[PDB]
């Protein structure tokens, strides 16, 4: 089973996650994310840095972006 969905405002931005095998959005723009064998996650803007969950990867992407719109 995939992780649960989530939806929150983090540092002023809307981050959403949902099983699809899992999708993350930052202000409605899809963020590429991937699950590692051990259960951790990364995103395309943090692709060498495992974090425990997809919400953690979304939050890490908001931290990385420093307010920048994500590109599809």
């Amino acid at each position: 089973a995939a992780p649960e969905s989530f939806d929150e405002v983090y540092k002023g931005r809307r981050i959403q996650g949902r099983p699809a095998g899992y999708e993350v959005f930052v202000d409605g723009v899809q963020l590429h994310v991937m699950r590692n064998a051990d259960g951790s996650w990364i995103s395309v803007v943090s692709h060498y840095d495992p974090v425990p969950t997809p919400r953690a990867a979304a939050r890490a992407a908001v931290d990385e972006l420093q307010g920048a719109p994500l590109l599809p």
Binding site: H32, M34, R35, N36, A37, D38, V44, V45, S46, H47, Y48, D49, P50, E64, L65, Q66, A68, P69, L70, L71
Partner: protein, 276 residues
């Protein structure tokens, strides 16, 4: 055909490497390397087909990718070769690597923008075109997201691992390849990406020219491991789903196998590499 420690380059060698990189950028060729790497990193998965990362072919794939880039550099200036960055030694922001005459320094703290060196956005010579967000300037935060580069002792512990790779041949594996890549253990290659920050922490990490120097040293460490373990070789050696076996060819080239890339001396030597 000799790859040198970046710390040892002469002023003239630094000038020529910078100029060749910037000409590949100007002509459009550089950005396609960025794009190839991002496509593989977004597709290489632990549970499916994996070729450039999180798999045994991580090492020969980056070897051939670096050879492609070096060949392209040499088409602009045949004297240029890829230098390597020994991050176990040159581990501070003060390393001449990060001088304005070479790669430029860390980014400012407001937006991570690199403000000096030949690749600073203000030069007009380094637009970030292949990207995951709107920002079009080179960014770094040296030592921002992780405090320390690997140390020589940590490197030696990885080099002491005798098996090249082990099932399941992915980010959960024991063995040299995955400890070198960094997904298990004290973490060598992945942690350097995280330490530089900016685009080097992302799928489009070749946007920072230090990508090449990092991977040239990772590639050197593979060579050093081979010298310490003459009795160990690439695995798997046949019939493994989703993974490139020794004699299978690798995408995107389709015409070369890990077997064709184990011996770097066919293509280049290092300034220094000890004998077993």
């Amino acid at each position: 055909t000799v790859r040198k420690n970046q710390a040892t380059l002469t002023a003239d060698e630094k000038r020529r490497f910078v100029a060749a990189v910037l000409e590949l950028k100007r002509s459009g060729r550089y950005d396609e390397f960025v794009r190839t790497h991002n496509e593989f990193i977004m597709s290489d998965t632990d549970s499916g087909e994996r070729t450039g990362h999180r798999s045994p072919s991580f090492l020969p794939w980056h070897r051939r990718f670096l050879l492609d880039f070096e060949q392209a550099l040499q088409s602009v200036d045949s004297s240029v070769t890829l230098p390597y960055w020994d991050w176990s030694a040159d581990r501070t922001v003060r390393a001449s690597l990060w001088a304005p005459d070479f790669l430029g320094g860390t980014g400012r703290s407001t937006d991570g923008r690199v403000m000096d060196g030949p690749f600073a956005a203000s030069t007009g010579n380094w637009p970030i075109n292949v990207r995951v967000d709107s920002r079009t300037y080179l960014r770094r935060s040296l030592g921002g997201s992780v405090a320390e580069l690997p140390t020589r002792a940590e490197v030696e512990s990885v080099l002491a691992i005798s098996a090249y790779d082990l099932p399941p041949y992915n980010s959960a594996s024991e063995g040299f390849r995955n400890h070198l890549e960094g997904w298990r253990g004290v973490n060598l290659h992945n942690r350097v990406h995280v330490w530089v920050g900016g685009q080097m922490a992302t799928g489009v990490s070749p946007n920072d020219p230090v990508f090449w120097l990092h991977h040239a040293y990772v590639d050197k460490l593979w060579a050093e491991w081979q010298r310490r373990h003459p009795d160990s070789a690439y695995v798997p050696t046949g019939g493994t789903p989703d993974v490139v076996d020794l004699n299978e060819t690798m995408k995107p080239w389709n015409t070369v196998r890990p077997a064709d890339l184990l011996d770097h001396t066919a293509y280049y030597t290092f300034d220094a590499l000890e004998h077993h």
